[PDB]
């Protein structure tokens, strides 16, 4: 096997001709390209380039594909070096893959002339002027919907309906109803246009923010339908109307990062709740059995010290009651300490995941 | 192109003559300076110097300006190496730029003989003896001003004016007024001298501590003016007198670092308050709908569990009330946990910014 000597700035690197021909379309392998740098006087290919990098670009030839950056070569000087050597776009994506950088930007505009134009208007708000106008209008509509959900429960507004029941009306006299119907009109129109102008109708019931739009529309329609057509469903439907607060995540990049963080960390949250349940059983049992004898004590059950154990372990506050025996006080100081000890353990994993997803936007 | 071989301690580094002449005023490029080190016996320029550094000083010649320190050469040995090679002050500032070190010390004393001398007396307190005397007097005046703002509201001092209103006086009988006027006299004199002796009068309404001095002077003048010349302005003006506590930041280097930290981290604080508002709506709605049926419960509105949700999520304390149902207790333990989970997420960014600005004084 004949040998080839390449001299990158005085540093002689040597290899067998077979190794650099494994990849033949590359700069060193291609006979013609490499011929330019060759110097016939000393039988060596002189190049003037970074010394620490050309070591990694000979490993790729001798290892059938692996591309790993030396830890003392900065990213920019390496990216340029794969380019001069002509290792190919497959190679540079693998280098990006080894530095683990997200590479997905797939935006298939339909390109049917009108479907594409209105999709550009309604999806990407930075594109135009009316796109930012539509973003501002949607955020203000969501905000007044939240304000109607909370101000409908205030006793001051309902002064004349505050009478015993034994004595959503379409009478259009209640102002909360007509402003609520205007909000649901806007949500329905916006969702139907985003359905009919999308470039992928099969994938539309896959994105989670679309399923947030649907479950925000639903309960007003089923209460209107059953009203102009139950008592178990009504208390559930009145609390599925709180999900319009999560429909404010299409316009925020902080709520979307908290959704990625809470998806990618479910094992840690399960460990958090499991450790809490263990500690609550243990400490509530010990305080019940160390304070039951005292005639002036208040713990009357083991499933009655649970709330005391929860608010003492999480350093919140009072509990239902407070220990009055010397023994209850020793099991209450151990409970206070063990609480922060057992809830601070899985939290650094969660904040590290957030910090990663928070800087990956950059 | 003729080639030049430089031998730094046995390690042969080689390059084309054109590369080291790109920068001609430098040590290697200048023919005469480099001629001293040259040894005609072996046609190589022997130098005895650090091996890991001379690699980076050949990249600068071959890369048109980039200067990056290898990660295994300590700062001091590199700083000296750019000096021996004679790369120029433009080069050494760029090296300081790449280690990101603050380089701004612009103090334009006016140099008009008297304006410069009294500016040195009043601005830089370490310069003299009377400068530290003036610093000590200003700090003591600020402290007794805070003490007058709080002791003017104590019911014990105002025993004889505690009568019904239907029955800032310049009568000079109230001792709080005359000591207050002495404090505002000192603030006004000090600010007017720092105006008339400054070397840049156009930039004087740009520094934030100067605008703190002005908004600390203002409300005493407008209440004196309107008194010897409203009922909406009076309750606002009585609370803009609390900014004399921030006028104590010219004499502290910890308050100035907290101001830099809170300026450079506003996106994180916005994310903190946004996450809190989301959690407060969600958990207050769930505890209102899981405890309303019980006839002995106390949550009468969704905008009535907001304070309970805030003080439970931030692990402070009681709340307006406490859950009495099994369902309220499950939505109250989840609220306690999710509070610390959603407020501990943006905080490491803020403490990292503080730690950076806190050690950059060194």
């Amino acid at each position, epitope marked *: 096997g004949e040998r080839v000597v390449i001299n990158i700035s005085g540093l002689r690197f040597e290899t067998q001709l077979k190794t650099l021909c494994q990849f033949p379309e590359t700069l060193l392998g291609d006979p013609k390209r490499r011929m330019r740098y060759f110097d016939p006087l000393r039988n060596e290919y002189f190049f003037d380039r970074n010394r620490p990098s050309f070591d990694a670009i000979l490993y790729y030839y001798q290892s059938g594909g692996r591309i790993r950056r030396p830890v003392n070569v900065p990213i920019d000087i390496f990216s340029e070096e794969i380019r001069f050597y002509q290792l190919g776009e497959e190679a540079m994506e693998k280098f990006r893959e080894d530095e683990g950088f997200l590479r997905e930007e797939e935006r298939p505009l339909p390109r049917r002339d009108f479907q594409r134009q209105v999709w550009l208007l309604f999806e990407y708000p930075e594109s135009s002027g009316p796109a930012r106008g539509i973003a501002i209008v949607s955020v203000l509509v969501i905000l007044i919907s939240i304000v109607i959900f909370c101000l409908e429960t205030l*006793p001051e507004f*309902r*002064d004349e*309906k*505050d*009478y*015993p*029941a*034994s004595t959503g009306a379409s009478s259009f006299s209640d102002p909360f109803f007509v402003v609520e119907t205007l909000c649901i009109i806007w949500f329905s129109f916006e969702l139907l246009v985003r359905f009919f102008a999308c470039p992928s109708k099969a994938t539309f019931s896959r994105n989670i923010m679309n399923l947030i739009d649907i479950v925000a529309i639903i309960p007003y329609f089923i209460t209107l339908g059953t009203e102009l057509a139950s008592l178990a469903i009504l208390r559930v439907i009145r609390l599925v109307r709180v999900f319009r607060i999560f429909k404010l995540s299409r316009h925020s990049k902080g709520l979307q990062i908290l959704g990625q963080t809470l998806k990618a960390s479910m094992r840690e949250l399960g460990l958090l709740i499991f450790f809490l349940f263990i500690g609550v059983i243990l400490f509530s049992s010990a305080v019940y059995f160390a304070e039951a004898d005292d005639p002036t004590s208040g713990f009357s059950s083991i499933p009655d010290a649970f709330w005391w154990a929860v608010v003492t372990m999480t350093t919140v506050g009072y509990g239902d009651m407070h220990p009055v025996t010397i023994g209850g006080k020793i099991v209450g100081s151990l409970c206070a300490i063990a609480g922060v000890l057992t809830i601070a353990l899985p939290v650094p994993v969660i904040v590290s995941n957030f910090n990663y997803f928070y800087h990956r936007e950059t | 192109g003729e080639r030049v071989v430089i031998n730094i301690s046995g390690l042969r580094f080689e390059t084309q003559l054109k590369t080291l002449c790109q920068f001609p005023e430098t040590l290697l490029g200048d023919p005469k300076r480099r001629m001293r080190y040259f040894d005609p016996l072996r046609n190589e320029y022997f130098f005895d110097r650090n091996r890991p550094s001379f690699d980076a000083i050949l990249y600068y010649y071959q890369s048109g300006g980039r200067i990056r320190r290898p990660v295994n050469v300590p700062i001091d040995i590199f700083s000296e190496e750019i000096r021996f090679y004679q790369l120029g002050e433009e080069a050494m500032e760029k090296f300081r730029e790449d280690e990101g070190f603050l380089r701004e010390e612009e103090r334009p004393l006016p140099r008009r003989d008297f304006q410069r001398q009294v500016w040195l007396l009043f601005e830089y307190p370490e310069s003299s003896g009377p400068a530290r005397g003036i610093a000590i007097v200003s700090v003591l005046v600020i402290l007794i001003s805070i003490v007058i703002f709080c002791l003017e509201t104590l019911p014990e001092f105002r025993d004889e004016k505690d009568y019904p209103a239907s029955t800032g006086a310049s009568s000079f009988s109230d001792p709080f007024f005359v000591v207050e006027t002495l404090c505002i006299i000192w603030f006004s004199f000090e600010l007017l001298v720092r105006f008339f002796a400054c070397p840049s009068k156009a930039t004087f309404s740009r520094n934030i501590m100067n605008l703190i001095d002005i908004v600390a002077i203002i409300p005493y003048f407008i209440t004196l003016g309107t008194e010897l010349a409203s009922l909406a302005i009076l309750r606002v003006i009585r609370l803009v007198r609390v900014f004399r506590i921030f006028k104590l930041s010219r004499h502290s280097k910890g308050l100035q670092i907290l101001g830099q930290t809170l300026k450079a981290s506003m996106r994180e604080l916005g994310l903190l308050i946004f996450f809190l508002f989301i959690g407060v709506i969600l958990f207050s709605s769930a505890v209102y709908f899981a405890e*309303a*049926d019980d*006839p*002995t*419960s*106390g949550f*009468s509105s969704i905008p009535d569990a907001f304070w309970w949700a805030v003080v439970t999520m931030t692990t402070v304390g009681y709340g307006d009330m406490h859950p009495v149902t099994i369902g309220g207790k499950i939505v109250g333990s989840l609220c306690a946990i999710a509070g610390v989970l959603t407020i501990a997420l943006p905080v490491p960014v803020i403490v990292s910014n503080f730690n950076y600005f806190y050690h950059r004084e060194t």
Partner: nanobody
Amino acid sequence: EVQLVESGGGLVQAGGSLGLSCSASGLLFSRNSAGWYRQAPGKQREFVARIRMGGSINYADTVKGRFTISRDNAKNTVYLQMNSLKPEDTAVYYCSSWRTGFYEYWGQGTLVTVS
């Protein structure tokens, strides 16, 4: 589980003065709206008084200025002070406390008939 018991009834003559009381357990009145309802013989119940939680008192036209409804806010007690009773009053009375949209509770009844 909850109960609304009341007393103070009987018969009275013209120009009388009396005070029915409503008490309960299983239901703090500090937290719920309450009122007194009467049912004249022959028609449906009408309202004597209402004290919506928060101290807002309203009365019907017939009892205006002759009746007062007060929650001692202690002892889970609501007391009505009727005054100068007239023969049109003759009726059977009832007590109540409710939360709009959730629950409604009644008393057993206790009558006051004016001679």
